[PDB]
Design a protein around this ligand. Structure first.
Ligand SMILES: *C/C=C1/C(=C/c2[nH]c(/C=C3[NH+]=C(/C=C4\NC(=O)C(C=C)=C4C)C(C)=C\3CCC(=O)O)c(CCC(=O)O)c2C)NC(=O)[C@H]1C
Length: 310
């Protein structure tokens, strides 16, 4: 059972309790975007990342308590209609905003219970071709190789691996596409503890996560608890959520500045990950993550199909 989070007096995580870190409720985000939470009926802004006012060019005193009706007059009606009470928390509303201070922004919203969680991130044929290349791959090894190469072409990531889970939850790199000069991980195996049980569980439900800068400090939400509930804000579905410090350290020690993975789910089980690295920090574009999500779904389908062919 999970430890309390750090802001509720929980311990700093160590290697004796990796599996007890409540990674879904860090009460903080990555600094390359901003996060607001809002009441699902009134649109009152209930929580904001500490960088939100600066990120959005708003006056801090105005921002909290403000309504989405006032902050987002052009999206609020659409947002309400798209995300009514009781909808799947996987359901998304997305809009592109031309924000004077911030530039071109992507807004992604989902509902958890009575709370709307709004993520603002800068934004900046290929999909169909990629989907068809996966389809047309003749066997599982070729499928793995095509998936890693295609994802690398689309993203420009220094390394893209297909990381397959064994029944004991150890992991193996079974294909990779890599920048010239990077050492090979192909065929290397890693302990189950490096992607602990609660992470593997989360990754069965929320299929993409990333760390854009492995040296960046997390930006707290304020207030840290959802005022509706006096309880933690569920961020398992927020790509902006802070990454486990233990994992961030693991990445820095690998010389990885940016990391992103996409779940491969076969028969409702976590089969593996498309796992990506960059040496420098790197914010992968939002619509481009959408493409990666589609490719993850296609790969998951094709792994099942290819495993059936044998
Ligand atoms: C004591 C806890 C530990 C720990 C925790 C931890 N690890 C993750 C997430 C990931 N770990 C990954 C592992 C690898 N990436 C690689 O490139 C290789 C090897 C070539 C390995 C073994 C991966 C891929 C992830 C997924 C996230 C990503 O793609 O960057 C988490 C969950 C992080 C989060 O979602 O907040 C946690 C808590 N890792 C350890 O090594 C020990 C110290």
């Amino acid at each position: 059972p999970f430890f309390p989070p750090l802001y509720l007096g929980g311990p700093e995580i160590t290697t004796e309790n990796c599996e007890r870190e409540p990674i879904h409720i860090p009460g903080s985000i990555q600094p390359h975007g901003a996060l607001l939470t809002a009441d699902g009926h009134s649109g009152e802004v209930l929580q904001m990342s500490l960088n939100a006012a600066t990120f959005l060019g708003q006056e801090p005193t105005v921002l909290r308590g403000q309504t989405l009706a006032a902050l987002l007059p052009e999206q609020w009606p659409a947002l309400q209609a798209a995300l009514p009470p009781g909808c799947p928390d996987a359901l998304q509303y997305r809009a592109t905003l031309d924000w004077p201070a911030a530039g071109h922004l992507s807004l992604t919203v989902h509902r958890v219970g009575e709370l709307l969680i709004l993520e603002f991130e800068p934004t900046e044929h290929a999909l169909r071709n990629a989907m068809s290349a996966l389809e047309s791959a003749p066997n599982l090894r070729a499928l793995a190789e095509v998936a890693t190469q295609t994802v690398r072409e689309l993203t420009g990531f220094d390394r893209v691996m297909l990381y397959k889970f064994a029944p004991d939850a150890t992991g193996e790199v079974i294909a990779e596409a890599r920048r010239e000069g990077l050492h090979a991980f192909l065929g290397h195996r890693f302990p189950a503890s490096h992607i602990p049980a609660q992470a593997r569980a989360l990754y069965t439900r929320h299929l993409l996560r990333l760390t854009a800068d492995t040296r960046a400090a997390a930006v707290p939400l304020d207030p840290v608890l959802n005022p509706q509930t006096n309880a933690p804000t569920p961020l398992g579905g927020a790509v902006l959520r802070a990454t486990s410090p233990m994992h961030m350290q693991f990445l820095r020690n690998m010389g990885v500045g940016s990391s992103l993975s996409v779940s491969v789910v076969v028969g409702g089980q976590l089969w593996g990950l498309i796992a990506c690295h960059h040496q420098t920090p790197y914010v992968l574009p939002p619509d481009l993550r959408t493409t990666l999500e589609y490719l993850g779904r296609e790969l998951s389908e094709q792994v099942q199909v290819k495993e059936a062919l044998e």
